[PDB]
């Protein structure tokens, strides 16, 4: 199809328009005083939401180049979403600010490469200052505080999170689950998670959560690149006649093997959901065997000649639940024998004993921790269904926030930390004038989130920004109560990782957009 090509200033103008449209749609939802956005559905009443992700998902425009701009900003908004779990709106606001200022500077006639260098230098210095500013949060009381703050100041959620992380460690795997009674329950089961994702989004049976959830499924392990679905057929017949879901851990599911499974799942029969085998090289086989001994199944290796089509139900292991999120899959309460897993961890720690290099020790210790750790299951307790769903959502949000806080600590919320960091870098300079202009662009854009929060609140952004800059430490503006005070003392807290990731991805997309020179799209027809 014939292509339309735009160069230089025209392409930059189109991208800027698209970015402005998307960011204006999204940023009105920032902060506790966020506005409502009405999204049209195919039928019925339109949905009214205050979530930036939902708004950003629907936005894409009729002009192809403006659509380019919107999609490029959305990409890094999603990237920040999948890194820390929150701050997509903040990242979008920062990206819009940097892109606007940088494109203005470029149109003024500055070298785009020097501007990109200046922005990168400023962002690196800001990351260093932000790491310096962060306070540790590993203390159990801090865990409870973060859990309460995330879950709308609820003590029970914080207590549950603190108990779970005390019982399974700070780095342990914790999974939320629906309870039975009004009392909450926390326990540990034999299971573990590994960093792999679904091959296609088509197996997602939890559209609101964006995850593939299988209850009491079979697991098909294969140390071979699975293709030729004809080989697959018999095990699917055996699984479907048993009325159970299937989770496939294969080296790589090729084409015509994931499409066939996708079609089968959408048509209704079989609830299979394939996933890549974690690791590579001999490590892939070792951890495949570890998963096999965890689930009680047998690894179907073509090297020795299991001949995949000849696999039976006994070959497949079983587990209580499997949850496949965007990048990790968790197996919860596998049916593997306790003696088998105990022997496996004994074998792996023996391998640690005669391990020679530090890499081998580290890897085998990782396997030992994965096998002997288990997963914590939090049973949310409440009276009715709506309370069940609200409690589960609150607990999982608090879990994400607490995990981030444990990872990188906490800083002042409400955009205060970014303002303090920007104030701390007022003397940074580059190699030439354009680099200094880029540094100033980044520092100025670092104050955008607080101004946007204030503007949504209804106050004057400039006055509040100046007042906050005049103060020091955790001094900031509470938009919920429309007052000034110590942000930490009033509970407004933000994980360091969230702000760092938002800033870094905003800077990356801004540099990419600034250095863009030509754009090629399809014809308007």
């Amino acid at each position: 199809a014939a292509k339309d090509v735009k160069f230089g200033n025209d392409a930059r103008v189109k991208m800027l328009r698209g970015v402005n449209v998307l960011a204006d749609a999204v940023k009105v939802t920032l902060g506790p005083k966020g506005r409502n956005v009405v999204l049209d559905k195919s039928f019925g009443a339109p949905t009214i939401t205050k979530d930036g992700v939902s708004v950003a998902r629907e936005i894409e425009l009729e002009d192809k180049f403006e659509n380019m701009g919107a999609q490029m900003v959305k990409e890094v908004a999603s990237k920040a979403n999948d890194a820390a779990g929150d701050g997509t709106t903040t990242a979008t606001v920062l990206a819009q600010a940097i892109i606007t200022e940088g494109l203005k500077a470029v149109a003024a006639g500055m070298n785009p490469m020097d501007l990109k260098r200046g922005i990168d230098k400023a962002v690196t210095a800001a990351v260093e200052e932000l790491k310096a500013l962060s306070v540790p949060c590993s203390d159990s009381k801090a865990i409870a505080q973060v859990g309460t703050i995330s879950a709308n100041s609820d003590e029970t959620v914080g207590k549950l999170i603190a108990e779970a992380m005390d019982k399974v460690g700070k780095e342990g795997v914790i999974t939320v689950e629906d309870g039975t009674g009004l009392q909450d329950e926390l326990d540990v089961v034999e299971g573990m998670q590994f960093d792999r994702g679904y091959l296609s989004p088509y197996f997602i049976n939890k559209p609101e959560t964006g995850a593939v959830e299988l209850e009491s499924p079979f697991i098909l392990l294969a140390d071979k690149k699975i293709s030729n679905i004809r080989e697959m057929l018999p095990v699917l017949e055996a699984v479907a006649k048993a009325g159970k879901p299937l989770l496939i851990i294969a080296e790589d599911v090729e084409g015509e093997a994931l499409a066939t499974l996708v079609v089968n799942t959408m048509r209704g029969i079989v609830k299979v959901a394939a996933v890549k085998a974690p690791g590579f090289g001999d490590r892939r086989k070792a951890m495949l065997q570890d998963i096999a001994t965890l689930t009680g199944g047998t690894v179907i290796s073509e090297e020795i000649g299991m001949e995949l089509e000849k696999a039976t139900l006994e070959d497949l292991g079983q587990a209580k639940r499997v949850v496949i999120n965007k990048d990790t899959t968790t197996i919860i309460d596998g049916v593997g024998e306790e003696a088998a897993i105990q022997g496996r961890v004994a074998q792996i720690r023996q391998q640690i004993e005669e391990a020679t290099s530090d890499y081998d020790r580290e890897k085998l210790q990782e396997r030992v921790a994965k096998l002997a750790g288990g997963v914590a299951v939090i049973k949310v307790g409440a009276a009715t269904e709506v309370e069940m769903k609200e409690k589960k959502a609150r607990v999982e949000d608090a879990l994400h926030a607490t995990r981030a806080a444990v990872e990188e600590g906490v800083v002042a919320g409400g955009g205060v930390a970014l303002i303090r960091v920007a104030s701390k870098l007022a003397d940074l300079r580059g190699q030439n004038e354009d680099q200094n202009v880029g540094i100033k662009v980044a520092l100025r854009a670092m104050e955008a989130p607080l101004r946007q929060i204030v503007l949504n609140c209804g106050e004057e952004p400039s006055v509040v920004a100046n007042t906050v800059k005049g103060g020091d430490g955790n001094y900031g503006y509470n938009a919920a109560t429309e007052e000034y005070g110590n942000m930490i003392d009033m509970g407004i807290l933000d994980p360091t990782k969230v702000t760092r990731s938002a800033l870094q991805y905003a800077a990356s997309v801004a540099g990419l957009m600034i250095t863009t020179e030509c754009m090629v799209t399809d014809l308007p027809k």
Binding site: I229, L233, L236, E237, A240, K241, E256, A259, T260, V263, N264, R267, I269
Partner: peptide, 12 residues
Amino acid sequence: SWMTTPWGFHLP
């Protein structure tokens, strides 16, 4: 031309 197994598999 999607072959269908007796148990319902929609083989493409």
